[PDB]
């Protein structure tokens, strides 16, 4: 069985980053080789990890979680970051086995005029916990007044929309990133590499 | 899923009113903050006016006050949007918006738009 990471890196659509698609692999045979030797990344950052030995590892797990943020937001998928993705939208831990992979989209997401359909939390009465996701849409109460789900005075809509135009600055491009979670359990490791 | 339509443009004549609606469909628990943006061809999307929730506070755009009103339509998330005294450059794709506020264009969920066409002769 080969792990089908295919369709996570080439998938046609990308989740928002506040919904974070989630793919767990497992049971495959895994040639990471059409990563680490492609030219086509903007960001492959490893952790804990050496890319190029990943043909000669085995895993419990891998988790390809992905996603579209702006490419000044990039940054924030790391451990120990802080600010509103690291935040509010997907969160890294501090002891993370893994890769992130980014690359600018801006021919694909970009949209003249805008592409809304890309969105991100921006109210949260808490911070994420590594790797928790929310998709929930209650409105945000910023004052002692309960909300009751209408927004208005002191309450807000939690969500808030990129727009991406393709004549906007790199750093406000949409880039597609895909984070690789290598984990390894006490138990039997059957991601493995090519032998 | 949430999703915004629009209705009501369409071709009309210079001075005239015209009133634009749009309704929220989807499954939801919230009542939307609810605005208008338009659009002329070659230019920048432009807000034009917001009305909260509960219909209580509404916010325009400096250029279309006194001669624009926003209200909240019959059904929850439904807003109307009535625009007098019609100038030629009122001419754009109207969009509608929800869940947000202010004038940048961040809010959360987005309508395909609605052309408005004003005419006029000239003598
Ligand atoms: C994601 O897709 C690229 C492109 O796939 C090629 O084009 C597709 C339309 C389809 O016809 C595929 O069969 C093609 O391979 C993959 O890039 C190719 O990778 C192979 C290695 O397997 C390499 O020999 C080719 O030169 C690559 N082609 C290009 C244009 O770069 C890529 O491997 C896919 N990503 C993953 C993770 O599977």
Known sequence: ?195 | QVQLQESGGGLVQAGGSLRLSCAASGRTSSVYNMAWFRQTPGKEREFVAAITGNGGTTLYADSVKGRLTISRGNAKNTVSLQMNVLKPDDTAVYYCAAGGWGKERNYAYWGQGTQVTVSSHHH
């Open chain 1, 1 to 195: 069985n080969l792990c089908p990471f295919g369709e996570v890196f080439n998938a046609t659509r990308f989740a928002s980053v506040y919904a974070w698609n989630r793919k767990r692999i497992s049971n495959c045979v895994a040639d990471y080789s059409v990563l680490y030797n492609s030219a086509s990344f903007s960001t492959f950052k490893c952790y804990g990890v050496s890319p190029t030995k990943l043909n000669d590892l085995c895993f419990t797990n891998v988790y390809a979680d992905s996603f579209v943020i702006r490419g000044d937001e990039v940054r924030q998928i790391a451990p120990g970051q802080t600010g509103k993705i690291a935040d509010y939208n997907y969160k890294l831990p501090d002891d993370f086995t893994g890769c992130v992979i980014a690359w600018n989209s801006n021919n694909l997401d970009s949209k003249v005029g805008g592409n809304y359909n890309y969105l991100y939390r921006l109210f949260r009465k808490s911070n994420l916990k590594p790797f928790e996701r929310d998709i929930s849409t209650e409105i945000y109460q910023a004052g002692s007044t309960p909300c009751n789900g209408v927004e208005g005075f002191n309450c807000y809509f939690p969500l808030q929309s990129y727009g991406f135009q393709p004549t906007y600055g790199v750093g406000y491009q949409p880039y597609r990133v895909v984070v690789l979670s290598f984990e390894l359990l006490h138990a039997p490791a059957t991601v493995c590499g090519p032998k």
